[PDB]
From Swiss-Prot:
<dbReference type="GO" id="GO:0001849">
    <property type="term" value="F:complement component C1q complex binding"/>
</dbReference>
<dbReference type="GO" id="GO:0044871">
    <property type="term" value="P:negative regulation by host of viral glycoprotein metabolic process"/>
</dbReference>
<dbReference type="GO" id="GO:0042802">
    <property type="term" value="F:identical protein binding"/>
</dbReference>
<dbReference type="GO" id="GO:0046597">
    <property type="term" value="P:host-mediated suppression of symbiont invasion"/>
</dbReference>
<dbReference type="GO" id="GO:0001872">
    <property type="term" value="F:(1-&gt;3)-beta-D-glucan binding"/>
</dbReference>
<dbReference type="GO" id="GO:0005576">
    <property type="term" value="C:extracellular region"/>
</dbReference>
<dbReference type="GO" id="GO:0031012">
    <property type="term" value="C:extracellular matrix"/>
</dbReference>
<comment type="subunit">
    <text>Homooctamer; disulfide-linked. Binds to C1q.</text>
</comment>
<dbReference type="GO" id="GO:0045087">
    <property type="term" value="P:innate immune response"/>
</dbReference>
<comment type="subunit">
    <text>(Microbial infection) Interacts with SARS coronavirus-2/SARS-CoV-2 Nucleoprotein and Spike protein homotrimer.</text>
</comment>
<feature type="domain" description="Pentraxin (PTX)">
    <location>
        <begin position="4"/>
        <end position="200"/>
    </location>
</feature>
<comment type="function">
    <text>Plays a role in the regulation of innate resistance to pathogens, inflammatory reactions, possibly clearance of self-components and female fertility.</text>
</comment>
<dbReference type="GO" id="GO:1903019">
    <property type="term" value="P:negative regulation of glycoprotein metabolic process"/>
</dbReference>
<keyword id="KW-0964">Secreted</keyword>
<keyword id="KW-0325">Glycoprotein</keyword>
<keyword id="KW-1015">Disulfide bond</keyword>
<dbReference type="GO" id="GO:0005615">
    <property type="term" value="C:extracellular space"/>
</dbReference>
Length: 200
């Protein structure tokens, strides 16, 4: 089935390495879940996994890796949920971020386990459509190479609703392949790798 035996490789860090995601449905989100499999080659202070932003706000949605933590941003750089758990370099890891504008509920999951959570994070904010959605780097470039991802990514998915631990664990299970998002679906949604990035 679609997007099953494929990943995207970022060989090195550079000023033009990134990947563009082109969903058919609009990116207007009152609540969402965004998952991705990451195998990091090297991590710096801010290594982007995926990032969504408009011209007025480049940090509408972001998931990145830090030296000792994993950071999930929704609706502005002031809104950071930090999971002090650290990804192992070279090791496939399923990361999900979930968020709901309703009470600012924000959760960060590592391999189907809740690694962090908080409330009142961008409460009442609606993520706007028409922005730029990238993997491995943030928008405008060329780019800042110290932010670029190095390694492998796959199974990038976005649902317009907060999944449950059942559904999240399943997305991180042996059938990760066939579980896709309705906004961004790995294997059907068009993802173009640029600047040296490319499928494997």
């Amino acid at each position: 089935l679609e997007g099953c035996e494929t990943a995207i490789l970022f060989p090195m860090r550079s000023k033009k390495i990134f990947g563009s995601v082109h969903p058919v449905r609009p990116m207007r989100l009152e609540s969402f879940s965004a998952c991705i499999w990451v195998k990091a080659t090297d991590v710096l202070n801010k290594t982007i996994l995926f990032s969504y932003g408009t011209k007025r706000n480049p940090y509408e949605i972001q998931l990145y890796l830090s030296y000792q933590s994993i950071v999930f941003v929704v609706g502005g750089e002031e809104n950071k949920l930090v999971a002090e758990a650290m990804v192992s370099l070279g090791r496939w890891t399923h990361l999900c971020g979930t968020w709901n504008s309703e009470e600012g509920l924000t959760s960060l999951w590592v391999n189907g386990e809740l690694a962090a959570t908080t409330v009142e994070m961008a409460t009442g904010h609606i993520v706007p459509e028409g922005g730029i959605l990238q993997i491995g780097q943030e928008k405008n470039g060329g780019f800042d190479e110290t932010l670029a991802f190095s390694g492998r990514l796959t199974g990038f998915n976005i649902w317009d609703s907060v999944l449950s631990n059942e559904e999240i664990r399943e997305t991180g299970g042996a059938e990760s392949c066939h579980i896709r998002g309705n906004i961004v679906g790995w294997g059907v949604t068009e993802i173009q790798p640029h600047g040296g990035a490319q499928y494997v």
